[PDB]
Amino acid sequence: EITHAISSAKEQVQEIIYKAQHNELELKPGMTLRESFEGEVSRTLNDAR
Amino acid sequence: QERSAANIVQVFKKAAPSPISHVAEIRSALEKGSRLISTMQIKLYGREDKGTGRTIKATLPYVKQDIPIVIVFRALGVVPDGEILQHICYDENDWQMLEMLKPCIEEGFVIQDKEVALDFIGRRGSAALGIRREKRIQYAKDILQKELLPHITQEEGFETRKTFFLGYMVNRLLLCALERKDQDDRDHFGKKRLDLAGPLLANLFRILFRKLTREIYRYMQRCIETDRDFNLNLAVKSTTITSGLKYSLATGNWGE
């Protein structure tokens, strides 16, 4: 179960990376696209743990 | 002892309440002895959107006030502005950097020959007051030859290589200012050197042996007056090197 959850989160992060690289990620107010990408990835990994 | 490397150009950002924004700093040293000689910065005056003049001004050692760059390029022996730009600009097609280079050219348009610019440098050489032109020029030319990038070379007739290194330093400055290249990493461990027993004892021995040679001079001033032959075994006070090395190694304080 634990390794499945970690693999699912890795896939989610890879999807966020794909979305950021093909310029389709949705930014947040007062926050840059790169900072939005980093914040979303950090959220995902913290929730994975 | 850990120290930043020598003879490498590093470019740093600066702070908001500072007219200077970008600074290229190089410390210089020689392949023989591996000792520091001189340091020479090239700063970028003018903040983002404030400080209308975004000129670049050098800081030569042994001069109190900072000289514009075109002045020192002319003083080193390349007067035509096309050649100055070419020493700075490797690719004429690029245009943003050339658009950021005009205020320097304008602030140093007055000079048109080597002698006048080299005097303009000389008028700032921090020496005594009122030296006449013909030897103010010699003083400034000596500064431009030695104490300016000794690692490049300290002999005359090779000013073109120093001009090329200045062009490189200015180009890296502009690359950091135009955001086309990132600022140098202070904490990068590849830009640091470790001084082991060899160089530390070399520094201390150089200091103490120059002390000894000054003692030899201060003895040969007096004894030669007597007009006698001397056997030099009373001319060397051997206790100077011994006491100095022993004091430094026993206390740790590295110096006189």
Partner: protein, 97 residues
């Protein structure tokens, strides 16, 4: 974990690799054991923590000393007021209750 090398965290990674493992995600547990890369990243984080503990305590001690000197002369008096050494009123009733 920042790109301390040029465009990477360690020289065992490729350029511009933003995956969780490259930028400081430790997939293992302490029981399972950390990889050398995870070990180094965890060492950077622990070093940051030690530096923080070592360095903020001086600012905190300075702040607490200044607060104590600012408030050292303030006492509740027998009429209920809160006054300093000059007799000046800071609060007409302590804690307002």
């Amino acid at each position: 974990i920042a790109f301390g090398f040029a465009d990477r965290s360690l020289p065992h990674f490729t350029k511009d690799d933003f995956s969780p493992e490259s930028k400081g995600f430790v997939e293992n547990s302490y029981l399972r054991g950390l990889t050398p890369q995870e070990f180094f990243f965890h060492a950077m984080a622990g070093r940051e923590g030690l530096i923080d503990t070592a360095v903020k305590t001086a600012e905190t001690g300075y702040i607490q000393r200044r607060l104590v000197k600012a408030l050292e002369d303030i006492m509740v008096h027998y009429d209920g007021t809160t006054r300093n050494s000059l007799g000046d009123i800071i609060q007409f009733l302590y804690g307002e209750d």
